[PDB]
């Protein structure tokens, strides 16, 4: 159909973060079986392979910002590939990797569709500017390059010349914030970005939260929604094998509800799954839990309802 | 009183399902202590023993439908015993076993009370017709025999000649669907059976779900409610020792709330607890968790509120 027409793009990348192992995101998510689990329901699955990310050896950092040029080249290659598969009219399922690739993932998406909206589901805001960071790990900094309101607040980081800020601050929604820097909270209150942190989720119930989210985004105009999703935004009971586990996160049920509502919009346009580290499972069973969780999230983004599905023929035959 | 006047009927039966061990439902639920935990609050507890289910050796199956005649004889004996103890005006607490016995449990209940309503709490719909099944395990097929709207859609399965469909499609409510076959979802959308899958529960909150359920059933007319309950409908963190654990289920708190609301109706008439398998506990502590969960569910169906109870005399003496 229009929905569940998928381009799958892997991105085995880790240099935006310290802990090596999130390169085995695409390896694991394909070997666990994702294309297969799509193709039962009417999913026009087309893989486009993992991107051959290069290796700049002299990745001389910025002051705090570490490994800038490899990340910039990576997200540039990714932005090209994602815009390419949105030219196919598919839904750019991207999986990595880390949040640093979401720069290119939303950039190439915005090349094709300038009027998008971002639902950034993460325990973190990831809105660190290169000035306001403390780690300088770029998975903490994707959002700052895409907000037009931070133009002038962004130094020209080497490797990000191709980057243009693409969304406004009133078009992005956070769901599930529970680990926020002082700088991040300051910018988040400064720009007036609508967010639903765990406070508001515990207040409203995830049904009310999703309803207010879709009213905030699509209540003015139907526009292609780009859900991007951290796996640590869930409570780490369900996803232990990820980079920054922060307790008191979203439950499995609530994330499934989020994805089912976003599917029932029918305006899903590009899905991003990041921060899956199989090297952080204390047992491989923990990895299995994290991956089955993420796969169930992705499948629920493409018609797999917990109430179930049926192909539209009479089964009483 | 009118409520908490209990007939307890065990049913040590397993032939509707493959995994041997749910015959130790009555053994375990009595040896954990259930009659005793009833009798403190004013529970006219009367056991009626485990039923002596026979063993037909030449249980020749249907095409997909396996073990039909032993299940049919079992549910016939059960329907006779349940109607017998509803002649005593008690509340037919039945525990098994599996969902195949719920055929006879609701059949004998409908013999006495034709205007009942079923709240089928389960992870599955169990609405497989003999045509639409894939396993042919009859715990996947109780509901198809009781719906009057599937008359003609039900082949004459050997052993189920005594079976008459008893309820309408608009009188049964599902709560907690999260694993539904395509045939099951097709029939569920076909008959317009009101269901509350985990999507709707995550949307509404269990208070709103129970309120809409009791408005949907009793909002027209006071009628005896037959809650029938799977233990896999809860999340398997609380109940691991059951046949089909499906993750993302109902929490323990929500199930307790369901039972407390159904008690506060006061129209509870027959309670069924199925699918308890102690042979599926990886440790006996897992069995202990599952059984204590189910026992607390049953006790909360008979006045045991989490706010507590008191016998109506002055305790300031």
């Amino acid at each position, epitope marked *: 159909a229009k929905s569940r027409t998928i381009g799958i793009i892997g991105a085995p990348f880790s240099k935006g973060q310290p802990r090596g192992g999130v390169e085995e995101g695409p390896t694991v998510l394909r070997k666990a079986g994702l294309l297969e689990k799509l193709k*039962e329901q009417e999913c026009d699955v087309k893989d486009y392979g993992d991107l051959p990310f290069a290796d700049i050896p002299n990745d001389s950092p910025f002051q705090i910002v570490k490994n800038p040029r490899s990340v910039g080249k990576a997200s540039e290659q990714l932005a090209g590939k994602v815009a390419e598969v949105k030219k196919n009219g598919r839904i750019s399922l991207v999986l990595g990797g880390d949040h640093s690739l979401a720069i290119g993932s939303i950039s190439g998406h915005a090349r094709v569709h300038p009027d998008l909206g971002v639902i950034w589901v993460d325990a973190h805001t990831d809105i660190n500017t290169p000035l306001t960071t403390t780690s300088g790990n770029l998975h903490g900094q994707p959002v700052s390059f895409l907000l037009k309101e931070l133009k002038g607040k962004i130094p020209d980081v080497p490797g990000f010349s191709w980057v243009t800020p693409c969304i406004s601050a009133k078009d992005i929604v956070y769901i599930g914030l529970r680990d926020v820097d002082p700088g991040e909270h300051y910018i988040l209150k400064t720009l007036g970005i609508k967010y639903f942190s765990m406070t508001e989720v515990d207040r409203l119930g995830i049904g009310k939260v999703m309803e207010e989210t879709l009213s905030y985004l699509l209540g003015r105009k139907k526009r292609p929604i780009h859900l991007s999703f951290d796996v640590d935004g869930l409570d780490p009971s369900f996803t232990p094998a990820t980079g920054t586990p922060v307790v008191g996160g979203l439950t499995y049920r609530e994330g499934l509800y989020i994805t089912e509502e976003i599917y029932k919009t029918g305006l899903l346009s590009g899905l991003d799954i990041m921060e899956v580290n199989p090297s952080l499972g204390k047992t491989p069973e923990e990895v299995t839990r994290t991956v089955n969780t993420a796969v169930a999230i992705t499948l629920a983004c493409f018609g797999l309802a917990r109430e179930g599905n049926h192909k539209p023929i009479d089964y009483l035959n | 009183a009118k409520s908490r006047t209990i007939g307890i009927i065990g049913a040590p039966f397993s032939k509707g399902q493959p995994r041997g061990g749910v015959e130790e439902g009555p053994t375990v639920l009595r040896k954990a202590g259930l009659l005793e935990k009833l009798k403190e609050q004013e529970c006219d507890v009367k056991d009626y023993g485990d039923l002596p289910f026979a063993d037909i050796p030449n249980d020749s199956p249907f095409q997909i439908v396996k073990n039909p005649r032993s299940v049919g004889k079992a549910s016939e004996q059960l329907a006779g015993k349940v109607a017998e103890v509803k002649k005593n005006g008690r509340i037919s607490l039945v525990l098994g076993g599996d969902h195949s016995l719920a055929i006879g449990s609701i059949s004998g209940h409908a013999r006495v009370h034709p205007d009942l309503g079923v709240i089928w709490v389960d992870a599955h719909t169990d609405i497989n017709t003999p045509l639409t099944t*894939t396993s042919g395990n009859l715990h996947g097929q109780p509901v198809s025999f009781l719906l009057k709207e599937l008359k003609g859609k039900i082949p004459d399965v050997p052993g189920f000649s005594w079976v008459t469909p008893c309820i309408s499609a608009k009188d049964i409510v599902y709560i907690g669907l999260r694993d539904v076959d395509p045939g099951e979802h097709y029939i569920l959308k076909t008959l317009g059976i009101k269901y509350f899958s985990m999507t709707e529960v995550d949307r509404l909150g269990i208070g709103k779900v129970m309120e809409e359920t009791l408005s949907y059933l009793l909002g027209r007319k006071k009628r005896p409610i037959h809650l029938s309950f799977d233990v896999d409908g809860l999340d398997p963190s609380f109940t691991p020792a059951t046949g089909t654990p499906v993750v993302g289920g109902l929490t323990y708190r929500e199930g307790l709330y369901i039972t407390e609301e159904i008690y506060k109706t006061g129209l509870l008439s027959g309670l069924d607890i199925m699918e308890v398998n102690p042979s599926l506990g*990886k440790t006996p502590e897992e069995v202990t968790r599952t059984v204590n969960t189910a026992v607390a569910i049953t006790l909360a169906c008979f006045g045991l509120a989490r706010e507590g109870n008191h016998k109506p005399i002055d305790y300031l003496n």
Partner: antibody
Amino acid sequence: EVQLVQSGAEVKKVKVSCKASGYTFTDYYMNWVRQAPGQGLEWIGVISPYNGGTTYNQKFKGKATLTVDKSTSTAYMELSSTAVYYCVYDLYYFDYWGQGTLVTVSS
Amino acid sequence: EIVLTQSPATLSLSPGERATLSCRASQRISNDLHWYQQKPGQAPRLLIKYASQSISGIPSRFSGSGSGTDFTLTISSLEPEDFAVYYCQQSNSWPRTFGGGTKLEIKR
């Protein structure tokens, strides 16, 4: 490709080698599995190469002990006192089967 | 701990037509098992990713079917070298049960 060297045939009344070769280690999970002679296949356990994450079989946690040797790409499964044994990779699949290691439980 | 039932225990069939097998699960594993070709005196050889998909040029005849407990292995182009003890094996439940053996034999 992913090719394995197992060692070895033993008679006991107990370590088993599985040398990874031909590829990049810490990319695939050492997964042990046995086959009783003339019988089906009995899964044992999965260890990560990053760390000794056990997740053994319920029945095999006592007798079988998997260890990790993540420096030199071998791994070891040890045993205390009857079947043939196999090490595979790609835990969701099983495509990278080893040699076959018969051990007898003998006197 | 999901018991995989291979309803043909052993089977004898000629070099010839289709030889569809069956691994019926105990639960709804939902398209999450595999298929194996343990030849005699050999390590097993994987055939199928998830009720489909023909791994790495395993030649022409090993299609399966899913959705969602009755999981089959069709041998469409029988190819009598394929007479081997087959196995199904679940993936997404712990711990990782196998089948039992689905020995294909020669019929003469």
